[PDB]
Amino acid sequence: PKIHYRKDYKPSGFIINQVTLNINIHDQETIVRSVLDMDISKHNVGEDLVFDGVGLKINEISINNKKLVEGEEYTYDNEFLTIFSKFVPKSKFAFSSEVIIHPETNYALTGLYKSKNIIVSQCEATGFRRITFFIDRPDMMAKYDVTVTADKEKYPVLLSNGDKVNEFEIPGGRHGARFNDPPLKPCYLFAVVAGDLKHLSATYITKYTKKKVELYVFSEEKYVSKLQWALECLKKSMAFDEDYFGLEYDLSRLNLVAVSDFNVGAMENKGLNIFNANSLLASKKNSIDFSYARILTVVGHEYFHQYTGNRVTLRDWFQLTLKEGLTVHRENLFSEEMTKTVTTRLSHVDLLRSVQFLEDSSPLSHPIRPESYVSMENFYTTTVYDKGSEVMRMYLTILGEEYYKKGFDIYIKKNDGNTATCEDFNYAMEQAYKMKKADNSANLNQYLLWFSQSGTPHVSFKYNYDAEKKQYSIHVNQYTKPDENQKEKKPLFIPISVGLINPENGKEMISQTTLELTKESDTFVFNNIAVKPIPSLFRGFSAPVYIEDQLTDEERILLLKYDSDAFVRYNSCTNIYMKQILMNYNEFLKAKNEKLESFQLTPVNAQFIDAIKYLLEDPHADAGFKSYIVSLPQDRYIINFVSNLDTDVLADTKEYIYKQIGDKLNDVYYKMFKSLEAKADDLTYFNDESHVDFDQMNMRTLRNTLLSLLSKAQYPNILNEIIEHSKSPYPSNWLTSLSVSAYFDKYFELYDKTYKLSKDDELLLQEWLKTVSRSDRKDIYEILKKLENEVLKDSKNPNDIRAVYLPFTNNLRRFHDISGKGYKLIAEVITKTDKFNPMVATQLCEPFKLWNKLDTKRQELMLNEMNTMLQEPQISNNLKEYLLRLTNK
Numbered sequence: 001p002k003i004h005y006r007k008d009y010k011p012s013g014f015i016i017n018q019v020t021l022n023i024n025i026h027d028q029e030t031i032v033r034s035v036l037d038m039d040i041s042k043h044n045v046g047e048d049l050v051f052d053g054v055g056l057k058i059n060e061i062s063i064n065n066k067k068l069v070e071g072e073e074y075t076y077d078n079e080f081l082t083i084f085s086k087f088v089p090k091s092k093f094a095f096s097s098e099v100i101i102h103p104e105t106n107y108a109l110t111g112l113y114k115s116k117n118i119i120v121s122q123c124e125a126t127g128f129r130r131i132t133f134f135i136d137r138p139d140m141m142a143k144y145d146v147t148v149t150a151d152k153e154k155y156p157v158l159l160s161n162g163d164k165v166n167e168f169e170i171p172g173g174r175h176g177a178r179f180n181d182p183p184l185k186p187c188y189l190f191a192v193v194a195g196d197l198k199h200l201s202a203t204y205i206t207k208y209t210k211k212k213v214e215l216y217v218f219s220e221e222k223y224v225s226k227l228q229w230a231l232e233c234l235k236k237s238m239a240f241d242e243d244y245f246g247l248e249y250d251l252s253r254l255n256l257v258a259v260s261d262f263n264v265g266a267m268e269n270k271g272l273n274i275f276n277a278n279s280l281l282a283s284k285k286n287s288i289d290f291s292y293a294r295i296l297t298v299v300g301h302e303y304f305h306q307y308t309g310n311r312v313t314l315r316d317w318f319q320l321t322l323k324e325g326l327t328v329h330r331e332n333l334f335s336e337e338m339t340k341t342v343t344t345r346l347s348h349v350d351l352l353r354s355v356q357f358l359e360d361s362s363p364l365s366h367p368i369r370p371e372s373y374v375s376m377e378n379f380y381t382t383t384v385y386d387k388g389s390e391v392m393r394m395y396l397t398i399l400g401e402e403y404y405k406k407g408f409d410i411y412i413k414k415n416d417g418n419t420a421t422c423e424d425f426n427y428a429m430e431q432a433y434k435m436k437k438a439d440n441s442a443n444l445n446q447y448l449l450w451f452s453q454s455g456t457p458h459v460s461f462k463y464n465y466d467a468e469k470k471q472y473s474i475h476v477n478q479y480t481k482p483d484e485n486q487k488e489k490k491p492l493f494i495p496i497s498v499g500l501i502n503p504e505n506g507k508e509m510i511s512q513t514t515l516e517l518t519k520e521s522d523t524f525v526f527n528n529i530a531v532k533p534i535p536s537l538f539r540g541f542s543a544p545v546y547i548e549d550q551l552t553d554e555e556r557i558l559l560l561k562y563d564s565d566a567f568v569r570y571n572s573c574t575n576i577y578m579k580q581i582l583m584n585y586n587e588f589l590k591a592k593n594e595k596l597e598s599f600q601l602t603p604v605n606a607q608f609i610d611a612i613k614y615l616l617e618d619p620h621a622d623a624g625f626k627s628y629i630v631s632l633p634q635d636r637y638i639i640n641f642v643s644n645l646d647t648d649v650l651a652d653t654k655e656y657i658y659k660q661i662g663d664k665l666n667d668v669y670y671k672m673f674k675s676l677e678a679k680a681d682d683l684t685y686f687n688d689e690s691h692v693d694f695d696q697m698n699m700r701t702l703r704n705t706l707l708s709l710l711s712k713a714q715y716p717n718i719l720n721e722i723i724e725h726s727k728s729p730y731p732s733n734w735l736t737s738l739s740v741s742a743y744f745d746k747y748f749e750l751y752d753k754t755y756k757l758s759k760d761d762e763l764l765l766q767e768w769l770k771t772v773s774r775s776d777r778k779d780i781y782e783i784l785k786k787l788e789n790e791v792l793k794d795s796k797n798p799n800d801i802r803a804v805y806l807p808f809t810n811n812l813r814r815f816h817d818i819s820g821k822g823y824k825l826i827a828e829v830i831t832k833t834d835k836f837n838p839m840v841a842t843q844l845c846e847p848f849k850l851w852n853k854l855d856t857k858r859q860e861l862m863l864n865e866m867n868t869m870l871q872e873p874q875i876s877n878n879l880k881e882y883l884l885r886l887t888n889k
């Protein structure tokens with residue numbers, strides 16, 4: 001296993017100036033001819049010419065139109081093409097090759113592959129080497145001239161980067177298209193698409209240069225009517241980057257293409273973005289509400305890459321977070337502006353503090369700029385993406401909007417058309433930091449620790465108030481637990497957005513303030529504070545940290561009701577919940593350990609329940625926010641606070657807490673579920689695919705959340721509401737009716753009903769699969785078997801496999817069955833999947849990420865299955881490295 005190190009970076013001894021491709025798609029094979037106009041770089045030391053080339057069938061290779069003989073002049077081991085230096089020229093030369101590949105049987109979905117009836121490429125990060133020989137690394141910038149030929153019947157639409165400069169007929173019912181893309185680009189941004197595609201189109205005129213940009217969105221003919229929202233999101237994305245960042249699109253045309261088989265969400269190939277179908281296609285009749293936020297973010301994400309990723313690219317893959325973390329940040333700013341709901345920001349924080357915090361306290365923990373990798377695909381992580389985004393967002397919090405836009409502009413102008421590192425961005429921000437602080441002595445050298453230091457910082461507080469002097473103090477410290485990456489952790493630059501709430505009237509006591517914590521501990525003092533305040537800390541979640549507010553539940557309730565910041569309210573609620581959960585957990589645990597005949601449980605705080613009722617009944621309060629407060633924290637958030645987690649005890653704990661709150665508020669829940677119906681399920685714009693109301697969708701989220709609570713509680717005659725719910729035109733509703741019916745005898749009745757509604761739409765069926773997979777059923781294992789035999793079968797579609805299994809993995813009581821059969825089931829799916837798709841195989845390993853946080857029995861069970869997987873003779877490099885790191889080997 002070759003290990004690559006960040007410290008070992010050095011420029012290539014070679015240069016690739018021009019790439020001339022001929023791609024020749026036939027029924028049984030695809031022939032790829034490539035001419036590389038190359039040169040010798042100043043870093044050259046007469047070394048062998050080594051190309052990346054994975055799974056290529058060599059017909060012939062040449063240097064300056066002279067054939068190379070195998071063995072005497074070169075060797076090829078199906079991974080590297082090694083041309084001995086004595087046969088390598090010392091000036092400008094041309095390398096050429098003709099190889100054969102087979103997209104039809106490429107089920108790894110990397111390189112060139114077939115998705116249903118569409119030929120499509122995926123080259124990031126190391127996919128281009130699976131198409132032809134190349135020095136497959138992002139710092140090898142080249143010009144591209146690409147010709148694609150194919151059967152005209154089967155592949156009328158041909159697409160690649162750049163401008164289409166020629167179209168021509170070919171004898172035998174074939175045709176060709178030539179694409180010239182003069183601007184330099186890394187090879188992972190190369191793309192090609194061939195198929196019977198249908199499209200929607202529009203013309204966008206840029207804000208400043210008034211340039212006409214042709215926008216095209218593609219899909220297979222059957223789903224062409226699901227492209228409308230995507231086109232709207234693209235227009236929105238272009239407008240936002242113009243309005244916020246002052247950035248216009250520089251090309252004549254932008255294509256978006258949806259394919260059914262895709263490993264991730266989408267890919268930002270220059271002028272040819274390629275999407276997972278579930279992240280581009282939607283209709284109000286055939287999609288759940290989440291699809292609309294999903295498509296908005298993903299279309300937005302790929303578009304913002306055009307500057308942060310494409311025009312300013314990476315020096316090496318260790319700088320991945322520079323384009324991904326920064327683009328997610330831009331996507332988040334975009335989404336918050338478009339949705340105009342507080343739940344947008346809350347949803348990102350909810351994701352980070354559950355999934356990413358878990359990762360960062362697991363053996364897989366890494367900094368957003370990793371120090372090493374075996375398979376780069378294994379580091380496209382929530383750490384690199386989402387913690388990266390938070391690190392990028394903190395710049396904005398520190399600098400403020402005005403100076404952040406100035407610093408960002410410096411970064412773009414100074415690095416446009418070039419490769420860049422994380423240091424380059426921090427430099428640009430430091431320039432704005434100097435301007436803001438009004439002295440050239442200020443620097444952001446400490447901030448670089450955010451890129452290099454792994455683990456989640458812990459921030460705790462102590463408060464003091466002197467009523468006589470009207471003086472308030474906030475004593476703060478930070479701490480990061482040592483791990484396998486850093487022996488000693490250093491204090492980070494932590495920006496703490498704070499407010500001070502007057503507990504008597506709920507008003508703000510000070511103006512907007514961001515405390516800059518740069519030491520291990522500090523004391524921030526405030527004068528002229530009339531009364532003892534309740535601190536509103538880390539407003540907007542201003543830093544990716546564990547917050548320990550040290551507030552009483554009384555104080556947290558007051559913030560929940562009266563604070564102005566959405567997150568702090570949300571977090572105060574979260575902290576009240578966590579305290580309750582941890583208390584009841586230990587009480588349940590001690591009773592189990594000591595085998596007690598009787599014991600007591602601490603009831604849920606009555607004033608807390610009163611506060612929930614208060615908010616729920618407030619008509620001016622946000623429906624989305626309401627759905628969060630009636631929901632306990634994510635299991636993966638909770639586990640970060642519990643050692644040797646007994647999943648049954650946690651399940652017991654949650655059930656007790658929900659029942660306590662339900663026994664008081666169920667009537668309020670039902671009353672709200674009925675009153676929200678009119679606005680939530682309004683059909684006025686059901687046939688307008690460009691009209692999306694995120695507030696209305698939040699109301700539906702609240703209704704479906706309340707319905708779930710009422711169903712679990714077996715509320716009187718709630719089954720009637722469930723039946724009526726199944727007749728709703730909105731998929732979010734009638735799929736909800738399926739999952740909540742799990743607690744009734746009518747489940748399999750709705751199972752068949754919803755299946756018939758879903759079966760004729762590829763994406764809708766996959767949502768149905770997720771709904772079934774996540775169903776709280778005692779017979780879920782029998783149900784999964786039914787899905788495998790009747791629906792899933794032999795499908796190699798990642799959307800299909802992930803839909804069937806991943807939701808089930810979050811079933812706290814059933815997946816973590818003490819027999820370990822849940823662990824055995826997924827390990828079998830992982831090993832099975834690994835034979836044709838290593839990336840998705842590692843994706844299916846997500847349940848095992850918390851293995852060492854569980855009780856000793858469940859630890860042993862998970863560990864056994866992972867060791868079983870590790871001993872599979874044909875295990876991929878991706879899966880092997882992932883499991884080796886996860887199990888600390």
Ligand SMILES: CC(C)(C)C(=O)N[C@@H](C(=O)NO)c1ccc(Br)cc1
Pocket residue numbers: 124125264265266267268301302305324377380385
């Ligand atoms: C769902 C989400 C994580 C946002 C995604 O699609 N990421 C892309 C990406 O960054 N597109 O620009 C992605 C692309 C390549 C690889 Br390998 C992994 C993830």
Ligand SMILES: [Mg+2]
Pocket residue numbers: 054055056057100101102
């Ligand atoms: Mg091959």
Ligand SMILES: [Mg+2]
Pocket residue numbers: 260762797
């Ligand atoms: Mg299919």
Ligand SMILES: [Zn+2]
Pocket residue numbers: 268301305323324327
């Ligand atoms: Zn991206």
